[PDB]
Structures are given as C-alpha cells and as structure tokens.
Design a protein around this nucleic acid. Structure first.
Ligand SMILES: [Zn+2]
Ligand SMILES: [Zn+2]
Ligand SMILES: [Zn+2]
Length: 85
DNA sequence: AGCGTGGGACC
DNA sequence: TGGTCCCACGC
C-alpha cells in the first residue's frame, strides 16, 4: 500500500512497486508490443500473445465436459460453467 | 461468443 | 526488469 501513483489527477495506490510500474503505462499510453499480423499495439506482452490467437485460431484450452476449445483459459472457465444445472 | 485489458502473483 | 499465468471486468 505504500506505493501511490504520482500522477496528480490519479489517487490509486499499490502494495507492490512493480504493480505501479505496469500501472504507469495506463497514464503514459505506452503500447510497446506489436502484433506482426495486424500491427496493433498492446500494453502487455501477455495480452499480445492471446490477441495473436485471434489470427491463427490457436485454442489451447479444451473444456473438460464437452472438449470445446478456447484461445484463453478464462474463456474456457466462463464456458465450463454452462454445463451445470 | 470474442476479446480488450488492468491488477496480483509467480518465476 | 520483464515474462507469463490467473482473474475480473467490460463491451
Ligand atoms: Zn495512476
Ligand atoms: Zn493482430
Ligand atoms: Zn464444455
């Protein structure tokens, strides 16, 4: 919690100094990761990785119940719960 | 659905 | 630093 965002208009606080560094990019608008397929810029390398799958169609996450594939684990997570009742 | 994207964590 | 998951939330 000791790490406050220096931007004046912003008052968000962070427990980890590094979580502030990432956060600073929201204010600086820095997007240092580019998709070589569509040239779009992204603020995070991990977000670029999952974005690229929208081009290749790579879906490494399969639902345990029906086997349906998803590009992201969170999409699979959101899906799996539909099998309930 | 499709998928951007920030915060927390872990390495 | 900086890479990479999970999470969550949003549209
Ligand atoms: Zn801030
Ligand atoms: Zn792209
Ligand atoms: Zn399923």
């Amino acid at each position: 919690r000791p790490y406050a965002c220096p931007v004046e208009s912003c008052d968000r606080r962070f427990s980890r100094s590094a979580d502030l560094t990432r956060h600073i990019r929201i204010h600086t608008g820095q997007k240092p990761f580019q998709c070589r397929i569509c040239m779009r810029n992204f603020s995070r390398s991990d977000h670029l990785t999952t974005h690229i799958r929208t081009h290749t169609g790579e879906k490494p996450f399969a639902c345990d119940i029906c086997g349906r594939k998803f590009a992201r684990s969170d999409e699979r997570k959101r899906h799996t719960k539909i099998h309930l009742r």
